[PDB]
């Protein structure tokens, strides 16, 4: 079912390029829906609880400057978004992903989206950064043309 | 290099606006477009072209979906045509579909994937569909002088 | 029903791969596809489309232009379709349309000028060329859902 | 410098829209510096079209920005009042020039995609961020291309 | 005639921010046909040479980097740059042209195109940027369809 | 980060008005142009280049092809760059190239396959290539500002 839900970040490298319309298209026009979105900074407590799993360069890094972090929403969302990305390594990407298209480093490579194979990581990650506040329900109507859900 | 597929952008495209997209795609890719038509399919062109899955549970949505709303029919010329068109479409459910293939980028989806193209791997399913979709005197033939630089052979 | 106007992609923005741009325009915009047809369009019609313009001294090399390839011949239904067709088409010489218009930007010459929009001050003009290039069976009468975010009087 | 509230309406949202208004006002050179998805309620809409509490439309137009979510933006640059009106183009996006974003997307009055503080009304532009988003939800910040964009700052 | 060139440059802003493609893209979309093209750094006396008529902005503004020399050719190929580039400062410059979609100061308004109103200003320019030899004479069969007395 | 690879926008690419969507492509892949000239190769130069390849049948019809008109010649900058040049080329065969890469979206040929990038699997291409269509004069050391976000080693 379609109310599954995963996190989408665009980082600081991605903020600086001025990638976030184009991130930001890429997951409409493939149909899911837009949830949540902030621009936010991130400060050094809020990174050491989403990088608690090189430690204190990652952090450096997501804390370089503005995220734009995101909440998607749709059929098999977590999957989707991460097959869009391309490997997080962005000189192994596939031309067509948005790291393949847009990054050439592992630790610069544009964006997080939650791993569809560590389970539950999708909701522990939007709970983080996130409240269900700054989380909207809503209807897209165009979702009856992206699914059978259809009229 | 007269080589013909039929290309359909199906109700779900047309209603998401991406007959513009889906028809750059293929010009971008080198292809001739020799017809074009924007129509709704009846229930009998429907039941015949969706013929091979009579049997099956999942016919009557089909049918019900491809008769949903308008669609833009086409036929594609170039060299290797079908199998061409199926490589930018992408695999057949949205999901399992390649970012970079028409169905990668727009799709989320098993039934509502955007679009149709004759199967290669069926032989004549491309002439076939045609004549199904198109008469004849619809199918336009042309010399579009930019295949002089797609095709090596028509340098 | 709404507002319709013939749209034609005349032979050289054929030719030059700019169909899909060209339809993308008028979708995003939020006009609706009622009728499309690639073909082909021979003297006589020519002779008919351009009535009015038979006693001026560029007619027969306007005439040889529509028909010296095939068309991407359309009607798009919307508010106001007519009028706004020919603003997102601009001034009819490529080389004083401004850039955002689709002659602004893909075209410079006033022959060969991309795309033909019916004339919004020519009254019943656009009814006219739609009963010429298309038939009322060539036409889909449909509900494009997102029209209901198009326009605030229909939602 | 400047700031601006630039909004994307119920109708962008829905209609998949607010990659392309974000990507164009990001390749004109101007900086996000807030930005939050989010439900409007008939108060806050009350109170942003409060100029027009008088006149007939008022009922349906707080219908309309309550109708979905929206995106809502803040935007800083050289005079980012005039350009983000600029590139929004008219407010009805029937005489909208082609180029502009209610000339390329949109075609009406009432569904006319996007707003942006009006830079005729001085104020407006601090009354109207001020009105949608708190000061911690702003977000300073120096980004390096600002440099290659504006000769004050090379 | 269809043989009119006009000198095209993408100022340095305009190198540093990655929209030379971008540019190109929408002179070869008008059926502009490229005939010199060139990636070269400005020193400072072509810099004196090429803004004779006026001035420390400038000459310190183009050989702060690296910039794309162009010669495009075509019918009235000067004045329709021009026109598809937009007012010198790209604050005033309208949505659809270069400046305007691109830009936001004068100093840095992202490309030069020489004047039509100045008259031998297009030949001028190009043959101080290019050499002759640099200049390359084609055929482009889309022209065939870009103009009808080519045709 | 300091690695170059030599690419060049080949006759056909050059003739559909391709070189700006080819640029446009590394560009936003991060890479970083430093040599860049339009130019024709005359038939000794096209020789040196494709000299690993005297012996074989489609040798003429490579060279004819090479100088058929002019094509662009580049050099790009960034960590890995001959590789990723090669990733987004896509296979060699334009028909086999995967959707997404530059000829998989652009091409539908082996002959006229759009865009030359340098071998990576040929220790010394890249620098032979390099050195072969381009003076160290033409080749510019500049500092990309955006570089320091593309990686985080130069930030
Ligand atoms: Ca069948
Ligand atoms: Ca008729
Ligand atoms: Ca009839
Ligand atoms: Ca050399
Ligand atoms: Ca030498």
């Known amino acids: ?11 600081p490298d991605g903020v600086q390029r001025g990638l976030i319309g184009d991130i930001v298209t890429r997951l409409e026009t493939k149909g899911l ?22 430690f204190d360069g990652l952090v450096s890094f ?18 989707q ?5 391309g490997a997080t390594d962005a000189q192994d990407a596939a031309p067509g992903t948005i790291r393949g298209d847009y990054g050439n480093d592992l630790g610069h490579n544009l964006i ?17 950064f996130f ?4 989380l909207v329900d809503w209807d897209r109507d165009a979702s009856a043309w992206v699914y059978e859900d259809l009229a």
């Open 1 to 11: 079912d379609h109310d599954e839900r995963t996190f989408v970040m665009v980082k």
């Open 81 to 85: 978004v991460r097959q869009l990305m």
């Open 33 to 54: 829906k837009m949830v949540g979105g902030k621009f936010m900074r991130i400060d050094e407590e809020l990174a050491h609880e989403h990088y608690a799993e090189f």
């Open 131 to 134: 409240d269900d506040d700054e």
């Open 62 to 79: 997501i804390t370089s400057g503005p995220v734009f972090a995101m909440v998607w929403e749709g059929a098999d969302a977590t999957r």
């Open 112 to 128: 997080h989206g939650s791993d569809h194979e560590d389970e539950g990581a999708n909701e522990r990650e939007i709970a983080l």
